[PDB]
Design a protein around this ligand. Structure first.
Ligand SMILES: Nc1ncnc2c1ncn2[C@@H]1O[C@H](COP(=O)(O)OP(=O)(O)OP(=O)(O)O)[C@@H](O)[C@H]1O
Ligand SMILES: Nc1ncnc2c1ncn2[C@@H]1O[C@H](COP(=O)(O)OP(=O)(O)O)[C@@H](O)[C@H]1O
Ligand SMILES: Nc1ncnc2c1ncn2[C@@H]1O[C@H](COP(=O)(O)OP(=O)(O)O)[C@@H](O)[C@H]1O
Ligand SMILES: [Mg+2]
Ligand SMILES: [Mg+2]
Ligand SMILES: [Mg+2]
Lengths: 155, 103, 204, 49
């Protein structure tokens, strides 16, 4: 615990941001740094420190976390500090695997709360939710022939 | 006897597909509007323009009553909301319009 | 029987036959995103609006502006109430060294501060949010239960209607498994998925 | 309400009513191979583009 000088990390991250004038940031594999901490309170304090530093800058950040054996995260604390939590799942049933997506928390507004199967394909992530389907069509007055003139005569 | 069902009653129309269930409900609503009252018709499987066209062939004029502000025709798929929010929306809408007949 | 304080959530007051207990702490437990913070926010705001009861929102984790913004979309003019001096948001931060072990925090020091906050607005309702930061440190079951009892007794002495938000973690009701045996009212909020459909559920 | 940043994954922006929060961190959790790295890569690339 506390072995890494988080302010040192903060200095570096600042350098990187000011290079490109970033407005979005991704922190990937922060488990390496925070798997060390072995007291629950100290770890939560450090995670809060990092999150507060990120929030101060006004940088839109995405942090990738590993589920491990947990419901959402291996160490079980990051999901209670962030404002938006998105769970990605890949489950097998009857030998068929399905990618699923869920927004567990999003403080500040309404959102979808179901599980939405998605697809990683040649162009990227694709979600076609079934909750976006309404009943607002348009109607036409022409008719379509069947190719069976007897059947059309029945209408 | 007496000329129909009692007013605040609950009426269930049952049948197979193509039976005429939607037509009877629309006749109920159209009559309710024709007497000057207000009606709300919640459809979960057909759209508003399509339902109007379909009922037009049976001689009903559901469009007249929509344009006259006496019939509110609401269409939403069962998968659009959760069972709680379906109820919430239905109750809120029924409150506001203050209908006499709800289908 | 006992006095009760209406929450403003009609339908939970009907179930509770009046509301949450007056002068005793209550525990709202849930996992992440279950709504146990909106519950306390609604409690405070409805109390101030419908009964003229000034409230205090003690937070050990979140910042006051974050709390204010998290409920803006729901129509609560929380910034108005804070300006009008009818609600106070108090941030009691803890550093990593502070939270290292048992008894590290001077609970009487906390009690002094909470008193200051209460007497600012003349509060009659209080919310303690994220007390896990302070009490996750304690690692002996007996010492932790003693400290939790100390805090609850101090709250009960003042006659302040309190709501405490607790995190389920991997437990049935609470992560550490002891707060539910010390409080008088326990409310569990749940968000379960079945056949890909999620349902919010509530239980007393 | 709050400001939001579009991710470029149309269909997740619709669910979120605009995208991920602006100025706040977000957590994407998953096991191995669940796509939580492609999510962040898409976020960054679509944001820049
Ligand atoms: N102009 C018309 N003349 C004679 N019959 C008609 C005419 N228009 C409609 N019909 C009949 O009215 C029927 C309408 O069926 P209706 O939709 O009311 O029953 P339903 O139980 O609601 O079916 P659904 O499963 O679609 O809900 C049509 O099947 C059609 O056969
Ligand atoms: N304006 C809103 N409309 C509908 N739901 C909302 C709205 N605002 C917040 N919610 C809900 O608030 C939930 C977060 O609950 P919250 O109490 O803030 O955190 P926690 O339960 O971890 O204490 C989100 O999952 C979101 O669904
Ligand atoms: N071009 C592609 N087409 C379809 N799926 C792809 C493609 N590229 C990667 N994938 C998916 O990327 C998955 C790995 O996800 P990734 O985000 O890179 O790691 P992790 O989820 O552990 O963070 C692989 O399981 C693979 O299915
Ligand atoms: Mg029909
Ligand atoms: Mg909360
Ligand atoms: Mg990865």
């Amino acid at each position: 615990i506390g072995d890494y000088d988080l302010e040192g990390l903060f200095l570096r991250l600042e350098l990187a941001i000011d290079t490109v004038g970033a407005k979005r940031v991704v922190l990937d594999t922060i488990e390496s740094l925070f798997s060390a901490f072995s007291n629950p309170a100290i770890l939560r304090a450090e995670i809060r420190r990092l999150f507060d530093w990120l929030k101060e800058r006004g940088l839109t950040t995405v942090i990738t976390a590993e589920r491990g054996d947990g419901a959402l995260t291996r160490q079980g604390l990051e999901e209670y500090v962030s404002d938006c939590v998105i769970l990605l799942d890949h489950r097998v049933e009857n030998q068929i695997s399905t990618r699923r997506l869920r927004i567990v928390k999003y403080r500040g507004t309404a959102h979808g709360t179901n599980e939405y199967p998605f697809l990683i394909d040649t162009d990227g992530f694709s979600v076609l939710p079934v909750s976006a389907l309404g009943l607002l069509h348009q109607v036409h007055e022409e008719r379509i022939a069947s190719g069976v003139p007897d059947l059309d005569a029945m209408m | 006897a007496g000329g129909g069902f009692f007013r605040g009653s609950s009426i269930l129309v049952s049948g197979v597909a193509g039976a005429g269930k939607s037509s009877l409900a629309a006749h109920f609503a159209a009559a309710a509007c024709a007497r000057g009252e207000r009606a709300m018709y919640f459809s979960f499987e057909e759209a508003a323009d399509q339902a109007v066209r379909n009922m037009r062939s049976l001689g009903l004029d559901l469009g007249r009553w929509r344009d006259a502000g006496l019939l509110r025709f609401m269409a939403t798929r069962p998968t659009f909301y959760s069972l709680e929010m379906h109820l919430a929306v239905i109750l809120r809408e029924v409150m506001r319009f203050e209908p006499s007949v709800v289908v | 029987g006992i006095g009760k304080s209406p929450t403003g959530i009609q339908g939970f007051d009907e179930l509770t036959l009046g509301g949450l207990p007056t002068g005793r702490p209550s525990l709202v437990c849930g996992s992440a995103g279950c709504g146990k913070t909106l519950f306390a926010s609604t409690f405070l705001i409805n109390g101030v609006r419908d009964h003229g009861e000034p409230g205090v929102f003690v937070t050990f984790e979140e910042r006051p502006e974050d709390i204010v913004n998290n409920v803006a979309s729901l129509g609560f003019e929380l910034d108005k109430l804070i300006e009008e001096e009818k609600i106070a948001i108090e941030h009691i931060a803890v550093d990593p060294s502070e939270v290292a072990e048992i008894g590290d925090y001077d609970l009487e020091g906390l009690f002094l501060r909470l008193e200051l906050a209460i007497d600012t607005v003349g509060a009659k309702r209080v919310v303690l949010d994220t007390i896990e930061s302070l009490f996750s440190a304690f690692s002996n079951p007996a010492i932790l239960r003693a400290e939790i009892r100390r805090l609850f007794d101090w709250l009960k002495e003042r006659g302040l209607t309190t709501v405490i938000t607790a995190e389920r973690g991997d437990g049935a009701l609470t992560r550490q498994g002891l707060e539910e045996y010390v409080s008088d009212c326990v409310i569990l909020l749940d968000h379960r998925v079945e056949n890909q459909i999620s349902t919010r559920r509530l239980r007393i």
